[PDB]
Amino acid sequence: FLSLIPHAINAVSALANHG
């Protein structure tokens, strides 16, 4: 029921712009 796989790929794909 409770999942966090798609929520983790959202915060990682953003850091790519801020190194």
From Swiss-Prot:
GO process annotations (BP): defense response
Tissues where the protein occurs: Expressed by the skin glands.
Intracellular or extracellular location(s): Secreted
Main subcellular location of this protein, as a coarse class: secreted
The UniProt record lists the keyword Secreted: yes
Gene Ontology terms: cellular component: extracellular region
Residues annotated with Glycine amide modification: 19
Keywords in alphabetical order: Amidation, Amphibian defense peptide, Antimicrobial, Secreted
Task of the protein: Has antimicrobial activity.
Protein family per UniProt: Belongs to the frog skin active peptide (FSAP) family. Phylloseptin subfamily.
Name the UniProt record assigns to this protein: Phyllospetin-H3
Gene behind this protein: psn3
